[PDB]
Design a protein around this motif. Structure first.
Motif, PDB file in Angstrom:
ATOM      1  N   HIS A   1     119.103 -11.339 137.346  1.00  0.00           N
ATOM      2  CA  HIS A   1     118.231 -10.242 137.725  1.00  0.00           C
ATOM      3  C   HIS A   1     118.568  -9.800 139.143  1.00  0.00           C
ATOM      4  N   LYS A   2     118.352  -8.519 139.414  1.00  0.00           N
ATOM      5  CA  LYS A   2     118.682  -7.921 140.699  1.00  0.00           C
ATOM      6  C   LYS A   2     117.389  -7.392 141.298  1.00  0.00           C
ATOM      7  N   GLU A   3     117.002  -7.932 142.447  1.00  0.00           N
ATOM      8  CA  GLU A   3     115.815  -7.489 143.178  1.00  0.00           C
ATOM      9  C   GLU A   3     116.185  -7.243 144.626  1.00  0.00           C
ATOM     10  N   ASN A   4     116.109  -5.978 145.040  1.00  0.00           N
ATOM     11  CA  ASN A   4     116.317  -5.585 146.431  1.00  0.00           C
ATOM     12  C   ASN A   4     117.697  -6.006 146.929  1.00  0.00           C
TER      13      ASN A   4
ATOM     14  N   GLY B   1     116.236 -10.424 149.576  1.00  0.00           N
ATOM     15  CA  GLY B   1     116.868  -9.969 148.358  1.00  0.00           C
ATOM     16  C   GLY B   1     117.371 -11.143 147.545  1.00  0.00           C
ATOM     17  N   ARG B   2     117.494 -10.905 146.243  1.00  0.00           N
ATOM     18  CA  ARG B   2     117.993 -11.911 145.314  1.00  0.00           C
ATOM     19  C   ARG B   2     118.910 -11.228 144.314  1.00  0.00           C
ATOM     20  N   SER B   3     120.190 -11.594 144.334  1.00  0.00           N
ATOM     21  CA  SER B   3     121.193 -11.012 143.450  1.00  0.00           C
ATOM     22  C   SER B   3     121.678 -12.092 142.491  1.00  0.00           C
TER      23      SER B   3
END
Length: 646
Positions: free
Chosen positions: A604-607, A599-601
């Motif tokens: 942008h927010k991904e997973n 995940g990457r916060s």
């Protein structure tokens, strides 16, 4: 389970199997009211076409204990909630659609559709394998609108779209239970209504050489002629098409401003008539309010309008009269003002607006207009304040200005519709009006005393088409934000829930695809900070805590039952994002669940959401969320960790 847009007012769910429609299902009418039998007949056609099921109409009592049947009742208990109220009782025994007025049955049918598989809308394919379950369990719905005015405006003057496109939008409006099509049919750059007495309104006013493109003052042009208009028979067809779907059409004939097209057809209508229909969208010609010929001309046009539009209300606009560019320094204006003792150009428009309000009343109709008709200069054109007062029966749609001006109009006795343009102009971008701003719109002006709330009859969302030339671009601008305004207009304020709305919108988008609506795809499935405003905060991260990649957060007080618990690692600020490896749940000091996915916060927010399987809690034990994450290329990062129970 249930996923209707707009969210109904009242619902109660029961345990067990849902009602299911089969080839043996019938539609039974337990009343002889001629209006209900009509609603049942088109309900039969609509449901039969979508499911492929016969669904025959049969009289009261011919029910088969082989399949569930649809029973249509007339129940006056719901009259207090209005003519649009309805109730649905669904179980394997039967599906009962009740309403005090026939209109409610149509809306009960739209909800029924939204509780069935979305393949209902698919124009092709083999539907015989489809299970026509009504939601997932037995239930009772009692539903009714919060506002009676739930309007969508389509601007066909800037660009003409035509019957096929407008019916497609009417289909969306009806599926969302929006009930007013505000039809903006005349402006500077186009006149779209056939007028038998004045054929140049369409033969001249409906054609232009080219159109400005890109944006205002772009310097760009498409060099492409643009034309189109509706015949009166076409309008009658569309009026009927909308009325069968519980939609009233409010036509708008722009006046005294936005009149360039009308003037080019009959130049005596304006003191500064252009040489041709404008090809840019900033040119705004005004009618001549000092001449008797203009009111006679407009009264005749409104006579033919009244013949083909049965609705009680007629919109005349009145917005953006360019006082200084059109009227200031014109001898006809200045002499008229001295003769009549008027001191400002707003007085000129008010004299015009009041006189049109009487003309419209003598035709058995009610005037409506933008808030400029109320007296005050909200556009900065040098018109000042009007000394005279607006006819109190005129309806005011408030798009521009300080809301205190709208509250003042309400306190003076006017019914108002809220279309504050910073919230409801669907021609604006998703940056200017995000989906969340549309859903959060509140039609009742803040600070208005409770006694006056009844004067706010609802809202209108506007699709201006300066920069919209195709139906696909029209869909992109209007949807999915129109879905949010439908819910603002219908659902009680206490039942509104944007995170839940976003989930239901993902399901509803399946229908929009099958119906050909090219809505904006990237907007539906969004995570927003406000989603977690009421969610427990179990921790944060800072540049200090990012010196470790192992982080522990206590959740002992929050683990009360087995099931799926969601951990959200939400970036707040900082130069860098965090890279997330896994999140885990510990019972005392031993792992009981782990969600390991990258995940990457950041910006942008991904997973960023991790699902943990909690066991039934062990009494006296501690529970800890352990998250494995590091800074991405740096440690200047701040964020919050949320914890949602099942």
């Amino acid at each position: 389970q249930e996923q209707i847009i707009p969210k109904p007012a009242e619902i109660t769910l029961f345990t067990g199997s849902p009602a299911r429609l089969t080839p043996d299902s019938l539609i039974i009418t337990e009343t002889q009211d001629k209006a209900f039998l009509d609603q049942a007949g088109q309900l039969q056609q609509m449901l039969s076409a979508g499911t492929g099921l016969p669904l025959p109409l049969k009289p009261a009592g011919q029910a088969s204990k082989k399949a569930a049947c649809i029973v249509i009742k007339k129940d006056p208990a719901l009259a207090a909630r209005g003519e649009e109220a309805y109730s649905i009782q669904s179980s394997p025994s039967g599906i009962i659609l009740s309403a005090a007025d026939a209109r409610g049955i149509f809306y009960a049918g739209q909800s029924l559709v939204q509780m069935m598989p979305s393949v209902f809308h698919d124009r092709t394919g083999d539907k015989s394998a489809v299970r026509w379950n009504i939601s997932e369990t037995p239930f009772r719905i009692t539903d009714y609108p919060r506002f009676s005015w739930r309007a969508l405006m389509i601007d066909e003057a800037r660009h003409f779209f035509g019957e096929k496109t407008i019916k497609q939008i009417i289909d969306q409006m009806a599926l969302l239970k929006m009930n007013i099509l505000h039809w903006h049919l005349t402006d500077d750059t186009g006149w779209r209504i056939e007028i038998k007495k004045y054929p140049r309104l369409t033969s001249i006013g409906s054609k232009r050489r080219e159109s400005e493109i890109g944006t205002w003052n772009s310097g760009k042009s498409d060099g492409t002629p643009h034309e189109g208009f509706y015949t009166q028979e076409q309008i009658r067809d569309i009026v009927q098409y909308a009325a069968r779907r519980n939609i009233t059409i409010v036509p708008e004939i722009e006046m005294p401003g936005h009149a360039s097209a009308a003037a080019v057809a009959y130049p005596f209508l304006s003191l500064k008539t252009p040489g041709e229909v404008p090809t840019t969208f900033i040119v705004n010609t005004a009618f001549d309010p000092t001449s008797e010929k203009t009111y006679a001309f407009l009264s005749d046009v409104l006579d033919e309008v009244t013949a083909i539009f049965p609705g009680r209300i007629i919109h005349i606009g009145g917005d953006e009269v360019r006082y200084d560019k059109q009227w200031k320094g014109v001898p006809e204006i200045e002499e008229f003002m001295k003769k009549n003792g008027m001191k400002s150009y707003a007085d000129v428009q008010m004299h015009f607006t009041n006189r049109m309000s009487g003309i419209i009343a003598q035709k058995g109709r009610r005037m409506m207009g933008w808030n400029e008709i109320y007296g005050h200069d909200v556009n900065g054109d040098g018109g000042g304040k009007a000394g005279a007062k607006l006819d109190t029966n005129a309806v005011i749609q408030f798009w521009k200005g300080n809301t205190s001006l709208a509250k003042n109009a309400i306190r003076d006795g006017h019914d108002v519709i809220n279309s504050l343009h910073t919230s409801t102009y669907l021609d604006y971008s998703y940056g200017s009006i995000p989906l969340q701003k549309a859903y959060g719109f509140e039609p009742v002006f803040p600070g208005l005393e409770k006694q006056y709330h009844s004067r706010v009859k609802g809202l209108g969302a506007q699709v201006w088409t300066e920069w919209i030339s195709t139906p696909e671009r029209l869909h992109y601008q209007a949807f999915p934000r129109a879905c949010a305004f439908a819910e603002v207009g219908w659902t009680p304020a206490g039942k509104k829930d944007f995170p839940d709305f976003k989930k239901r919108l993902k399901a509803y988008s399946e229908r929009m695809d099958l119906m050909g609506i090219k809505f904006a795809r990237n907007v539906i499935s969004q995570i927003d900070k406000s989603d977690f405003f009421n969610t427990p905060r179990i921790g944060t991260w800072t540049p200090a805590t990012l010196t470790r990649e192992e982080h522990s957060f206590d959740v002992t007080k929050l683990v009360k039952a087995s099931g799926k618990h969601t951990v959200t690692l939400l970036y707040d600020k900082g130069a860098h994002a965090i890279e997330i490896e896994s999140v885990a749940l510990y019972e005392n000091s031993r792992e009981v669940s782990r969600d390991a996915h990258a995940g990457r916060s950041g910006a942008h927010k991904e997973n960023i959401q991790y699902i943990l399987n909690a066991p039934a809690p062990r009494q006296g034990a501690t529970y800890t969320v352990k998250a494995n994450f590091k800074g991405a290329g740096g440690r200047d990062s701040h964020g919050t960790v949320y914890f949602e129970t099942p």
